[PDB]
């Protein structure tokens, strides 16, 4: 029913490691990685492909999918070929395979055992724009990074090194996903810094600070305009479904006109404009009207050069320019005469 409760149950299933269990798991993981590198040395194959194969057989055929980094599409066929190629190796070499498998299994068990930490850390990041479950999952990504990067040699407990990467992943998630209009992480940092600055400033000023005071507190490079524009780009959008009035019958979006699609008046005006332009062009001859329509783009929509209309009508560019000139001139005279195209000039 409640997804969080359900997940907390599934997490409550796997029991917490002891110091020895943790050390052994980490050790098996590390030695497993070493073994994969060794198998890469021996076989002369790609360490990543080998890792994906070992992980494939450990996880089973329940999960097999093409890895973005891998060169070959990963399917039961290819993993069977590679597995059999790994079965083809001498006892001391074939040993490293077992080391690798044990490594993967240890990795899985390590993550699964440490899933609680992620929750305990993520519970404090709520209200920041991401759901609890999302924070948890991103934190889980962090946990995975921590597992693959851990060194048991340092004798530090796993939680210490894990927490760093977990917080890292949660915060990266918050910075990346939380805005309908996405903002770069460094810019989000600058914006939050501006917020904290303004909040401290207001905490000592007994009022909201001006742009100038914030600019002062931000240091050199920061003036009022920079603070103002930074606050401008930080603005988040508002819902079109935002309710208006105490009833349920009015949306905020109902008050917003469409500026894109031309109005009936605008359309009709463009129509009468085209018709009138044709009327005026019909007082010219075929050639000068056509030259004008070509140069101004009434024909294909593009505006032809003098050399194009000149090569089209078979005259010099000077000539075509001259007939364009006289065309425009006759149009000017007729326009002064009938005053027909004047009203379309606004």
């Amino acid at each position: 029913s409640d997804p969080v409760r359900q997940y907390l149950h599934e997490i409550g299933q796997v029991p917490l490691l002891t110091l020895e269990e943790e050390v052994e798991l980490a050790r098996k993981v590390e030695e497993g990685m070493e073994a994969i590198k060794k198998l890469s040395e021996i076989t002369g194959l790609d360490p990543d492909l080998i890792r994906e194969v070992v992980r494939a057989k450990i996880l089973g055929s329940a999960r097999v999918r093409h890895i973005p980094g891998l060169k070959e599409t990963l399917d039961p066929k290819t993993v069977e070929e590679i597995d059999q190629k790994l079965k083809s190796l001498p006892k001391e070499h074939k040993r490293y395979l077992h080391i690798a498998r044990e490594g993967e299994a240890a990795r899985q068990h390590l993550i699964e055992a440490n899933l609680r930490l992620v929750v305990s850390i993520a519970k404090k990041y709520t209200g920041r724009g991401l759901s609890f479950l999302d924070l948890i999952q991103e934190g889980n990504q962090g946990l995975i990074r921590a597992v693959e990067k851990f060194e048991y040699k340092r004798r530090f407990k796993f939680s210490t090194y894990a927490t760093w990467w977990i917080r890292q992943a949660i915060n990266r998630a918050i910075a990346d996903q939380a805005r309908t209009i996405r903002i770069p992480v460094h810019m989000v940092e600058t914006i939050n810094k501006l917020s904290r600055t303004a909040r401290q400033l207001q905490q000592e000023l007994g009022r909201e600070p001006t742009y100038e005071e914030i600019a002062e507190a931000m240091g050199p490079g920061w003036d009022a305009k920079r603070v103002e524009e930074t606050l401008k780009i930080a603005q988040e959008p508002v819902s079109l479904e935002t309710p208006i009035g105490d009833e349920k019958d009015s949306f905020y979006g109902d008050f917003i006109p469409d500026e894109h699609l031309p109005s009936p008046v605008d359309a009709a005006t463009q129509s009468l404009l085209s018709e009138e332009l044709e009327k005026a062009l019909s007082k010219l001859s075929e050639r000068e009207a056509m030259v004008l329509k070509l140069r101004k783009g009434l024909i294909d929509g593009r505006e032809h050069t003098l050399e194009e209309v000149g090569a089209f009508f078979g005259v010099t560019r000077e000539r075509i320019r001259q007939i364009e000139n006289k065309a425009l001139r006759k149009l000017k005279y007729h326009e002064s005469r009938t005053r027909k195209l004047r009203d379309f000039l606004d």
Partner: protein, 452 residues
């Protein structure tokens, strides 16, 4: 309705409360065999798919009542405060101390009254060496300094004049040594008193016996073989690289560690005994020790009558998953079925694809003639959907979404209002949730994330 699944059940499968089984591979839960479209809980699916196991804590200072690799029956106490709830192969988890019994084969002399000595070509442990009517004083036949080495029972004397030993005497049970360590002894002074019956210790056996008769006494040169225990303490950051009861030689390492100076290396030939484990792991499994190269690696799943190790000699008994133990040099199969039980709309989509419509229509038609009113009712309600799909030409599995459509953007606008501020439809936020979660799903898959 189509798949005959109650609302609660479909809720459970789609939302990942419960697994549903496809191609069960003959799993068994509580004595009852498993067939398709059965509803399995998490514990049930885990017991069936990954096998049944448990681990138990050992309070500080307490040792095991059982041995590593040893089969165990339910109810059998592994410790004074620990009883296993199941049957199977017990395994040691993180032994705190490792005892090494060191093999020593040496030569030691003794002198006894001829009347007392019982003549034998060899002496087994505990076997009486001699029977003495009166107290007898064993005396030193050499001069030098005394090295007294005391076993659990029985003793050794080594006389060294130059620091080079000139004598080795054996003192079986019943002989109380009259000398201390490092004592200076001249020739013919008593090193011991023998009283009543004297016999071989339980720790040491006499492999060979030579005897020289001189005067009224016999001098026995005994070729003896015995083991001397040495305890090693294992810290939590250390791991045991050696199996239970493994023959080791000088230079080999019993227990590794972070740094080489804290390592445990074997000083001499001896057998290894693992004591005081941090915890004990009871698994239902079949053990298969191997003397050579193994054909299957860790994680592979295998049926009875399958190749395991030694070029096809040792094979599989039960159904299970293969854990290859290099430390104990044994292939261990934890008993588990290969059963395929999925969750979510993927399972449902699979079952939907596997529905043959005409067949189900026939079934429901035969169901419509039943005397019961309720059965006819439900069969009618089902046959309505079945025939709806049949007549329409719609595939049932289309009720599951592989590809979620996306509305044209102008119908879910992002628009700058009068003041230059932005206003937008909620559908964008919904779609963003969707895409974030999907992408994170693809990345979690590609990176081989755990099942939870």
């Amino acid at each position: 309705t189509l798949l005959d699944l109650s609302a609660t059940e479909l809720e459970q499968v789609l939302y990942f409360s419960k697994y549903i089984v496809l191609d069960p591979k003959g799993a068994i839960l509580n004595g009852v065999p498993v067939e398709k479209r059965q509803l399995l809980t998490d514990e049930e699916y885990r017991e069936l798919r990954y096998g049944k196991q448990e681990t138990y804590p050992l309070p500080p200072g307490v040792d095991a009542l059982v041995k590593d690799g040893e089969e165990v029956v339910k109810g059998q106490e592994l410790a004074p405060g620990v009883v296993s709830r199941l049957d199977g192969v017990a395994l040691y988890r993180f032994p705190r101390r490792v005892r090494v019994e060191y093999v020593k084969k040496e030569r030691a002399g003794l002198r006894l009254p001829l009347a007392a000595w019982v003549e034998k070509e060899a002496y087994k442990p505990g076997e009486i060496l001699a029977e003495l009517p009166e107290p007898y004083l064993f005396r030193a036949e050499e001069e030098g300094v005394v090295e007294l080495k005391e076993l659990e029972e029985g003793a050794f004397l080594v006389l060294r004049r130059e620091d080079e030993p000139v004598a080795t005497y054996f003192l079986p049970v019943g002989m109380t040594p009259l000398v201390v360590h490092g004592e200076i002894v001249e020739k013919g002074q008593p090193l011991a008193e023998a009283k009543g019956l004297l016999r071989m210790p339980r720790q040491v056996r006499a492999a060979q016996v030579e005897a020289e008769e001189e005067g009224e006494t016999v001098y026995l040169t005994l070729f003896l073989e015995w083991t001397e225990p040495k305890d090693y303490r294992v810290q939590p950051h250390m791991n045991v690289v050696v199996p239970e009861g493994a023959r080791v030689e000088a230079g080999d390492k019993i227990v590794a560690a972070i740094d080489p100076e804290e390592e445990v290396i074997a000083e001499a030939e001896g057998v290894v005994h693992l004591h005081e484990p941090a915890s004990i792991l009871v698994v239902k499994a079949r053990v298969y020790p191997f003397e050579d190269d193994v054909e299957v690696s860790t994680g592979d799943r295998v049926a009875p009558g399958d190749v395991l190790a030694d070029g096809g000699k040792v094979k599989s008994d039960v159904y299970g998953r293969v854990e290859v133990d290099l430390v104990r040099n044994v292939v261990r199969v934890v008993e588990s079925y290969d059963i395929d039980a999925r969750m979510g709309a993927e399972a449902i989509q699979q079952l939907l694809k596997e529905l043959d419509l005409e067949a189900l229509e026939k079934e429901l038609l035969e169901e419509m003639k039943h005397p019961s009113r309720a059965r006819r009712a439900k069969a009618r309600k089902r046959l309505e959907v079945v025939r709806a799909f049949l007549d329409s030409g719609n595939r049932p599995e289309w009720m599951i979404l592989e590809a979620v459509p996306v509305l044209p953007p102008d119908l879910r606008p992002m628009v700058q209002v009068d003041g230059g501020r932005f206003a937008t439809s909620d559908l964008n936020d919904l779609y963003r949730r969707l895409i974030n979660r999907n992408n994170r799903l693809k990345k979690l898959l590609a990176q081989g994330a755990p099942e939870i």
